[PDB]
C-alpha cells in the first residue's frame, strides 16, 4: 500500500480473486440482501442516493428484504453499520439525504451516518459501495434507491398489509426520470405519477462483488473517506462516530464468483478524502490502448475528446487514436458505444428538452460527430465512409401496453461498464465524462477484471480462448440486447466478424425505423430542428391512432438495440446562453 500501482491506483492488483457480474438490480439487491443476512461484524456503505425503505426482494410480501429492516436488524445483533451518504445542495437536487440519515439513525444506535459535504459546492461523492465484514463487498452503478431494481424483462407497467401485493415498484420505486422528478421522500408508499397512463422508465445499470483482498482495498477506501469525513464536521469529531480501520490483508461466498485478477481504481481528491488519484480514467486508457480487438462500452455519459478547455479527458481520443491505428493496419477492430437514448433528467422532449437534457446532448454530440473534436469528424477525414464498420452508437428502447394501446420508452442506461477483447472488463460509478474520470471532481470508485481462465471462443472468425468472466457479461449484454431468447439462430460467440457486425447495425437500424413509424418517439433523426420538432410532435402517432395496426408492425422488432439518432436537433446550438461554469455537465 505504500506506493502507488499499476495505472496509479492506491491498491495493487490482486490474483485469485472470486468476482462475480451483475446486469440490472434484481440480482444485484438480491446478492446484497444475502450478503447482509450474513454480516457478523461489519457493514460499510457509500451512496449516492439511498432510499431507506427500498424492497432488496421483489414481489415484498412482508417487510423482510426491506432495506431498513434488514440494517435494524443487524444492528441489534451488534453489527455496526457505517453509512456514508452524498449531502446534495438541498431545493436544488432532492434525493433528501437529511431524511435518509434521520431514518437509518432511529433505526438503532449501532448504526452511524455521515454526510459529506457541507461546503457549497458542485461535486459530489457518487460512488456505490456495500462492504459486509470487510470481506465481501458490491460496487457497480447501483445506488440502493428508488428506480434502479429492475430485471432484463423491462416492464414498462406495474398495474397488478402487503401480504399478497403484487406490485413490483410500490409508490416512490414507480418513476419516469423524464416525465416527473421525486418528490416527499417522506412518503414512500405513494405515487407521484399515474400508472395507469403514465409508463416507468426502465433502468439498466452493471455492478459486481468481489471477495477477499480487492474487497478489504475497498474497505480501504471506505475506511480513509470515514476517517477523514470526521475531521470536516464539529459533530462527527465526537467519539459516537468511532475511528474506522482496517484488517491486515494477510487475513461466507457468494455463489457465482468466477476467479479473475481484481484490481480496485477509484477517483478522489483533497475535497472528498485526503489525496488526489484518477486510476480509473488511467486504466480506461490503458485498456483501450491495449485493446486487440473489440471494446464494448455502456456507460450513462459519453463526454470526452479533450478539446477547448471544456473537456480535459482523452477517452475519446484513444478509441479515435486505436481505430485509426486498426484501419491503418486493416486489421479487424469494432467499437460498441451503447447510450442512453436521453439524459436521464425532468423534461419535455417535446419541447426539445429541459437545460439538463440540452447542455448533455450538446457535450455528447460535440464528443461524437460535431465539431473538429468529435470522433466520427475525425474518422470521415482519415478513412471516409469506412467509419460504420469500426463504431457504433446505440441506445434500448422497448414498448409494451398502457391503456388499451402500445406505449414506447427508453430503457436508461445507467451501466459504467467497459469489456475488451472478452478478457478484460471495467465496473464502477465512473461516468465517461471529466466529472468523474478527473478525480478533482465527484469521488468515483471502480475495479479492472482481468481473465485468468478462458474458454473456447471465436474472434473473426477464429479460434479465440476468451476470458470466462468477461465472455459470460458480454454475451449476456448482447443476448438481452439483441432478445436472443426468441431468436436462438443468432450465434453470439464471434463479436467482431462482419457477418455478425451487419446484424448488429440492421437490427439497430431496423428497430429504430420500427419505432418512429410506429411512436414517432424523440430522440430521432427526423427533427433536425426545434422548428421541425414543433410540427414533428403535432402529428398523433399511430400506436394512438390505430392501436391493432400498431400491434401488427411492432411484431417486427427484436431486442432493444436502437441506432443512436446523431442528427437529432442538429441544425441548433443547444446550449444554455448566467453565471455558471459549463464543467457542471461535462
Ligand atoms: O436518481 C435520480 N435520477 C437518475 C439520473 N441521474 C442519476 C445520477 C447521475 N449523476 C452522475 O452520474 N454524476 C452526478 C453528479 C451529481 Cl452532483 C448529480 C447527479 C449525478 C445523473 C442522472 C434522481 C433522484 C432524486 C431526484 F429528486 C431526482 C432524480
Known sequence: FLQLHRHDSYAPPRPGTLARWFVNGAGYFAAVADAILRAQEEIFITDWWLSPEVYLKRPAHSDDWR??????????????????????????????????????????????????????????????????????????????????????????????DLSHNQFFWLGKDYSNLITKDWVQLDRPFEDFIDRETTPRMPWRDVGVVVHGLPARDLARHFIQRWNFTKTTKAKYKTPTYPYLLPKSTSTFTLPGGQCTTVQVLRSVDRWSAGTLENSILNAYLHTIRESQHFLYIENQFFISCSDGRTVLNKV??????????????????????????????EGDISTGGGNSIQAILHFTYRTLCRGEYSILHRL?????????????????????????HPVS?????????????????????????????????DSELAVLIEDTETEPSLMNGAEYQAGRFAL??????????????????????????DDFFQLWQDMAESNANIYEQI????????????????????????????????????????????????????????????????????
Open 67 to 160: 432495506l431498513d429492516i434488514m440494517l435494524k436488524r443487524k444492528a441489534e445483533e451488534g453489527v455496526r453499520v457505517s453509512i456514508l451518504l452524498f449531502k446534495e445542495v438541498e431545493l436544488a437536487l432532492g434525493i433528501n439525504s437529511g431524511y435518509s440519515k434521520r431514518a437509518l439513525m432511529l433505526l438503532h444506535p449501532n448504526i452511524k451516518v455521515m454526510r459529506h459535504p457541507d461546503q457549497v459546492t458542485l461535486w459530489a461523492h457518487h460512488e456505490k459501495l456495500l462492504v459486509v465484514d470487510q470481506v465481501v463487498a458490491f460496487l457497480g452503478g447501483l445506488d440502493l434507491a428508488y428506480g434502479r431494481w429492475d430485471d432484463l424483462h423491462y416492464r414498462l407497467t406495474d398495474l397488478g
Open 316 to 345: 475519446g481520443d484513444e478509441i479515435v487514436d486505436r481505430i485509426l491505428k486498426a484501419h491503418k493496419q486493416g486489421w479487424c477492430y469494432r467499437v460498441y458505444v451503447l447510450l442512453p437514448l436521453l439524459p436521464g433528467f
Open 380 to 404: 470521415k477525414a482519415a478513412m471516409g465512409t469506412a467509419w460504420r464498420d469500426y463504431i457504433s452508437i446505440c441506445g434500448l428502447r422497448t414498448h409494451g401496453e398502457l391503456g388499451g
Open 519 to 586: 411512436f414517432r418517439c424523440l430522440p430521432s433523426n427526423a427533427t433536425r430542428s426545434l422548428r421541425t420538432l414543433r410540427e414533428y410532435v403535432a402529428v398523433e402517432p399511430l400506436a394512438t391512432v390505430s392501436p391493432p395496426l400498431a400491434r401488427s408492425e411492432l411484431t417486427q422488432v427484436q431486442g432493444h438495440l436502437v441506432h443512436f439518432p446523431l442528427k437529432f436537433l442538429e441544425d441548433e446550438s443547444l446550449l444554455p446562453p448566467g453565471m455558471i461554469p459549463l464543467e457542471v455537465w461535462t
Open 409 to 441: 420508452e427508453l430503457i436508461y442506461i445507467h451501466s459504467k461498464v467497459l469489456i475488451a477483447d472478452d478478457r478484460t472488463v471495467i465496473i464502477g460509478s465512473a461516468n465517461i465524462n471529466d466529472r468523474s474520470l478527473l478525480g478533482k471532481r
Open 472 to 497: 459470460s457479461l458480454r454475451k449476456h449484454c448482447f443476448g438481452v440486447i439483441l432478445g436472443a431468447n426468441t431468436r436462438p439462430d443468432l450465434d453470439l460467440r464471434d463479436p467482431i466478424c
